[PDB]
Design a protein around this ligand. Structure first.
Ligand SMILES: [Mg+2]
Ligand SMILES: [Mg+2]
Ligand SMILES: [Mg+2]
Ligand SMILES: [Mg+2]
Ligand SMILES: [Mg+2]
Ligand SMILES: [Mg+2]
Ligand SMILES: [Mg+2]
Ligand SMILES: [Mg+2]
Ligand SMILES: [Mg+2]
Ligand SMILES: [Mg+2]
Lengths: 62, 32, 205, 361
RNA sequence: AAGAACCUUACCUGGUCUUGACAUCCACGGAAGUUUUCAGAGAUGAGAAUGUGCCUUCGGGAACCGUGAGACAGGUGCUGC
RNA sequence: CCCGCAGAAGAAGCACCGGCUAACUCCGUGCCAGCAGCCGCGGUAAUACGGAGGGUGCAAGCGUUAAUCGGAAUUACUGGG
């Protein structure tokens, strides 16, 4: 299947072990799955503060 | 060519706010 | 499992005194209270249909310090019991221990009444009990243990409770530091500012 | 008070930028690494490495020593001017002018080196501009962009020759090709290749309706008549045919196009210079190889030339310009250099974007 | 546009000034104004003759010129969607 | 489970804030990034995007996804045409 990459900017490649989460976008024809940012190999987004549980960013350690 | 016939590079038409094709049911807010 | 924040900001969202900061000074004596509850609070709200029932429910929870997981569990027992489910909820919230201590004047705040209970300083029916959710049985005695005898809060709060209404379903003995829990409290006998019927409709959505 | 010293201040800060370009620290670090590897006893025992180690040496010695020549040179020119003003030696005033200029002439030597002009950047080139989609709105943008480039090179002095021009339907072309004769003509124009966005209220629809048109431009050089690697046979195809109408004073008075294709990888070139069919096919195969030549250089960039495979394909210089007419805001998407003068850059004030493209190109 | 030879003229080329052609506020000194010569396309820049009036806030206000620190001024620059 | 020993000393995060559904206006981006459950938001003046401040809802849990039922009187026997 084809899945959607959430978040702003990704770190994927020709071979990456990602984690597929259900969910339709209803904006791309045929995309009916999302990709969990911050899972197995797909890393979390960069510089994220508001909703970081979504997109797997830990916390500002400052 | 193929780097221009990509489905991105298409003539984009904007919905004008007033005039022909301007009507909105409720708009960006519906505060009542 | 507690609030642990600015006390009277909770009263500002309601617009009335919820008595959870009360000593002597009424309402800050100053700047803003019973008014704008935030930054954009000077702007009046519109109070939608859900929010009227919501702020009614939130007001009652801010009074007794009960969280939503727990308050809903009082609603389960209130609804399954006989009689008026709108009335039984305020009955079970009244029989809650920290309320009973607060109605004695043993503590000057429902938070302070938890401070005395949680730090094992109150013996209900002779037995020391540190559960703030202790539903007090009718025709029972509540008492302060000797380690809290005149320990600078009991004296200060009990003298502060002279401006109260001295609740009719109870018998406090100011000078023996021992209370007495009389009958179940009547619906008409409590605060009566609370529209209890808006609460029951909310959880029955 | 000396405005020459005001240029010495300007050249010195620019020298700090010139040092800021080349990473002057790592220049002196790497140059000593070539030094240590030549001490190795097998320099004569590794002949091919020895010519290469000297090549790595000599290429940096023309730069690092020049960087140090600009260091100790500028400090003396900083001395020779201030000594001249404070002592009033008329010849010292006259000599310091030549002392400042030669450093700029070294900055000019770094200028082509910072431009790192290699293959055919010092040579003439060809243009190739295609119209987008949506009828007349696209071809006007094909026209207005092309005729901006035509008015551009004339101010710079580059000779212009329309190799081929294919008019679309209503005031504009669908494809065009222009030969730009000039010194470093490919060097000033190479980086302009990509898609150019046009945003304007269209004059073609009643009312308004701001329309977004697209058009691309492709700049490929002159390959010195032969690359020295001929990949000619390659399913060759000739299609020479008459063109639109030769109406009155239509282009070149030729109307004799020579459509040539290169089937593998799909390369199409054409020529409309003269009636002599053998002359045009000779000239079209010249640019066919050049268009095939730019394909060979993109493959190097596709692997590890200048892409820096870090996370993914870092590049995609397709949308390199945005021309918003009704907001008078021309933005380059490769540097971020903006300009609030449409008709100036529609006349050819494109030097601000060349230096922007010189940085990343 | 109820009227482009300069002016208008906002555009082009070259020559130039930049808290400025225009306004108020600060400081210092100088009344203003009038005549005339040189370089120069002109703008300006550089000199020389000339006058110092009204009240007494008398150690200046009212006027006017020049040089600076800035606050700003200025825009016929973009958007009539 | 009781008794005794300290300075409140060791113990607060998570989603959301256009409407549905409790809760805002300022910066940065500019149909490009991105949001989404649905209606749809982003075109240089966004309450929907990305930060900040301020709130709301829950709270050692909070959200997301998967799955069943409910709203579905949209399989209606109770209860439709
Ligand atoms: Mg719990
Ligand atoms: Mg000029
Ligand atoms: Mg102004
Ligand atoms: Mg104006
Ligand atoms: Mg609301
Ligand atoms: Mg936001
Ligand atoms: Mg906050
Ligand atoms: Mg369902
Ligand atoms: Mg059913
Ligand atoms: Mg039916």
């Amino acid at each position: 299947v084809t899945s959607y990459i959430g978040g702003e900017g990704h770190n994927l490649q020709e071979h990456s072990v990602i984690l597929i989460r259900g969910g339709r976008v209803k904006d791309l024809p045929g995309v009916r799955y999302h990709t969990v940012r911050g899972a197995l190999d797909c890393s979390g987004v960069k510089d994220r503060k508001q909703a970081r549980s979504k997109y797997g960013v830990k916390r500002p350690k400052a | 060519e193929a780097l221009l016939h990509d489905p991105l590079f298409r003539q984009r038409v904007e919905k004008n706010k007033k005039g022909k094709g301007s009507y909105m049911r409720k708009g960006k807010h519906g505060n009542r | 499992a507690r609030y642990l924040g600015p006390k009277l900001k909770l009263s500002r969202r309601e617009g009335t005194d919820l008595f959870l900061k009360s000593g002597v000074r009424a309402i800050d004596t100053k700047c803003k209270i019973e008014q704008a509850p935030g930054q954009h609070g000077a702007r009046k709200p519109r109070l939608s249909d859900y929010g009227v029932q919501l702020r009614e429910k939130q007001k009652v929870r801010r009074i007794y310090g009960v969280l939503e997981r727990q308050f809903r569990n009082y609603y389960k027992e209130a609804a399954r019991l006989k009689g008026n489910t709108g009335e039984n909820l305020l009955a079970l919230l009244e029989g809650r221990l920290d309320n009973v201590v607060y109605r004695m004047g043993f503590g000057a705040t429902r938070a302070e009444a938890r401070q005395l209970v949680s730090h094992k300083a109150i013996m209900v029916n002779g037995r020391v009990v540190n559960i703030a959710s202790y539903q007090v049985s009718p025709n029972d005695v509540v008492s302060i243990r000797e380690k809290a005898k005149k320990q600078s809060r009991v004296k200060a709060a009990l003298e502060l409770a002279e401006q109260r209404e001295k609740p009719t379903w109870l018998e406090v003995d100011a000078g023996k530091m021992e209370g007495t829990f009389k009958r179940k409290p009547e619906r008409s006998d409590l605060s009566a500012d609370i529209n209890e019927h808006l609460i029951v409709e909310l959880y029955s959505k | 008070i000396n405005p020459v010293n005001n240029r010495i201040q300007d050249l010195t800060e620019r020298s700090d930028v010139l040092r800021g370009y080349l990473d002057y620290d790592a220049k002196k670090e790497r140059l000593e690494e070539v030094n240590a590897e030549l001490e190795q006893p097998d320099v004569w025992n590794e002949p091919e490495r020895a010519q290469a180690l000297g090549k790595e040496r000599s290429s940096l010695e023309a730069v690092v020593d020049t960087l140090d020549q600009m260091k100790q040179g500028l400090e003396d020119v900083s001395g020779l001017l201030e000594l001249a003003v404070e002592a009033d030696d008329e010849e010292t005033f006259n000599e310091a002018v030549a002392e400042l200029d030669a450093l700029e002439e070294k900055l000019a030597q770094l200028e082509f080196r910072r431009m790192f002009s290699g293959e055919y950047d010092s040579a003439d080139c060809y243009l190739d501009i295609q119209a987008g989609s949506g009828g007349t709105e696209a071809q006007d943008w094909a026209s207005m962009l092309e005729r901006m480039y035509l008015r551009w090179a004339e101010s710079r002095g580059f000779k212009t020759e329309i190799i081929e021009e294919s008019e679309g339907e209503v005031a504009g072309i669908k494809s065009v090709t222009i030969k730009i004769s000039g010194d470093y003509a490919y060097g000033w124009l190479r980086t302009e290749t990509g898609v150019h966005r046009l945003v304007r209220k269209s004059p073609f629809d009643s009312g308004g309706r701001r329309h977004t048109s697209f058009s691309s431009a492709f700049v490929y050089p002159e390959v010195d008549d032969d690359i020295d690697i001929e990949i000619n046979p390659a399913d060759l195809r000739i299609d020479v045919y008459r063109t639109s109408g030769a109406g009155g004073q239509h282009v070149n008075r030729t109307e004799s196009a020579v459509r040539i294709t290169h089937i593998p990888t799909g390369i199409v070139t054409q020529c409309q210079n003269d009636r002599s069919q053998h002359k045009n096919k000779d000239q079209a195969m010249k640019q066919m190889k050049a268009k095939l030549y730019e394909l060979e250089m993109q493959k190097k960039n596709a692997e590890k030339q200048a892409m820096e495979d870090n996370k993914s394909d870092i590049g995609w210089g397709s949308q390199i310009r945005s021309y918003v007419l009704d907001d008078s805001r021309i933005k380059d998407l490769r540097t971020g250099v903006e300009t609030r003068n449409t008709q100036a850059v529609l006349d050819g004030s494109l030097d601000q974007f060349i230096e922007a493209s010189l940085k990343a190109g």
